[PDB]
Ligand SMILES: N[C@@H](CCC(=O)N[C@@H](CS)C(=O)NCC(=O)O)C(=O)O
């Protein structure tokens with residue numbers, strides 16, 4: 001059975017959406033309303049992913065895989081000739097896992113208060129301040145090489161690109177950002193990235 | 203030359219501390235003050251880890267590994283005879299990665315606002331309600347087999363055990379916890395876990 005990605009336009013599921021197109025694998029996509037927990041076909045989303053989140057990926061055996069970090073590694077390992085991630089058993093792969101975790105916990109989850117309407121503006125200010133330093137730090141790494149893990153685009157870039165879009169949408173102040181902005185411009189040119197954004201009607 | 207772990211007692215660094223002992227690897231440990239950013243020996247911690255957090259592992263080549271999720275996988279892969287995680291490329295490995303990410307992003311990072319005095323009280327209430335649901339979800343999974351990933355103890359259990367201790371220290375409300383509680387008692391009886399806790403003076 002063909003892989004299916006459950007997504008919501010602009011959410012963190014854009015990351016494995018980009019990876020799927022970079023990978024060349026066959027897949028379909030299915031949009032989810034995150035409030036109603038219904039998919040675009042009317043189906044009950046909690047019946048599919050009990051965690052009620054995107055992304056979730058239906059594998060070719062019918063089983064479900066959740067968590068962006070797990071999904072992009074699963075995909076990249078499926079197409080080793082495309083080198084979307086360092087091979088397993090290498091120190092480089094542990095560094096990739098390191099950066100994937102940083103993005104997931106410090107960038108991605110860092111945004112959570114900003115997307116909750118019940119969050120008092122005084123705290124949002126504090127939260128934005130922390131993200132400033134986190135992205136500024138990322139900028140300092142992007143000063144040393146073209147992509148996050150080095151000279152080549154990787155699944156970690158798909159994830160970073162995705163959450164960096166949120167920073168832009170929320171007009172996040174970022175102290176050091178000249179390399180980050182140039183990087184965002186570079187990644188945005190990739191045909192797979194553009195195809196992902198179009199398919200999500202962005 | 204042997205591996206060294208930077209840690210603070212009962213912090214998330216307890217997780218790889220446990221894994222090191224479960225793994226039977228030779229290693230030393232070294233404590234870190236998270237305010238002054240000074241190790242127990244004098245050194246500047248920001249020199250060592252610029253993100254200024256524990257855990258951080260010093261590998262044999264002298265290099266540093268950060269992010270607990272990366273550290274525990276590195277250690278597990280080093281001792282396949284101990285079967286502390288499924289081997290790379292297997293579906294079971296992706297489910298372990300999935301759980302590790304859930305623990306890092308949904309449980310671990312969920313605690314951060316609760317320990318921070320700048321968090322508004324009503325945001326803390328929202329966070330507690332979410333952790334109630336997330337731990338209750340974990341509890342329902344633990345009804346199915348002895349440990350988190352199946353019948354065998356794994357690095358995901360070291361991590362889960364570590365963050366669940368915080369739930370207990372805060373007396374967090376968890377609606378379905380009968381399986382979680384039995385699990386916690388079982389894990390706390392493991393010789394490696396006792397030695398970790400004792401070495402950290404807890
Ligand atoms: N730990 C999950 C977090 C996924 C996540 O936060 N998804 C958001 C979209 S950005 C979501 O689905 N929110 C809906 C909800 O939490 O109810 C992962 O890393 O994949």
Ligand SMILES: N[C@@H](CCC(=O)N[C@@H](CS)C(=O)NCC(=O)O)C(=O)O
Nearest residue numbers: 105213214236254255256257269270
């Ligand atoms: N993203 C890191 C988070 C690690 C972390 O938050 N460590 C805490 C201890 S529980 C810490 O060292 N805090 C000190 C600080 O933030 O300055 C990881 O997943 O390993």
